[PDB]
Amino acid sequence: VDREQLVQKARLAEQAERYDDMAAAMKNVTELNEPLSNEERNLLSVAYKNVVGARRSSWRVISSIEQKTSNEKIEMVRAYREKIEKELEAVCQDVLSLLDNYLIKNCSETQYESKVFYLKMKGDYYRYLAEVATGEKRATVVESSEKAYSEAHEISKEHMQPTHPIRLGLALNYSVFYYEIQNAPEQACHLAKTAFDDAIAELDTLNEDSYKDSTLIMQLLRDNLTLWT
């Protein structure tokens, strides 16, 4: 295949809700070992979010049956949870190695938006690993999630407008990280509130090509703040 054909396959796979196909095409595109265009970046993220998501869903269901069920069935439930878990971990590692070995690694200096987009993805996929991890393994992935979000945050503060959708979406997930993973509801509300306030303070920084995305994520920040407070 050529690159155009892989990307066309990803677009078709998306429409067909065949997300394993979509992710495999976008991984192949990444493995051509060149930067991704905005569209390629978005296709990659959409593909893997869908793959990790279903299971992020299946794991919650089987974990819940496990908690309600736990007679000894229990062996099965537990085995099946662990199978789903291992799939979910392998998906995350699949993305994290694309990020570490290609996308972050080779991102050019002036491509701040890409940098922040990939560091946020790195935070996200360590956070998905943290959702299922326990013990010392949890401590490690939690540290790695926060390190990735923190670096994304520093770059975005320096190089992007407070209204930029990628900066706003980062604040959204970083604050979810504080709320849900670290159970630090003050640190979560402060981050969300700050990101919202800073965007509001600068509506004049909305872009004619992205203002709908900016305002949508502003509302998402607000929705979380309201829930949490």
């Binding site: 959409v46 996200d124 849900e180």
Partner: peptide, 9 residues
Amino acid sequence: SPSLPNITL
């Protein structure tokens, strides 16, 4: 969840 909605293509 409370996290960012997946991108619309």
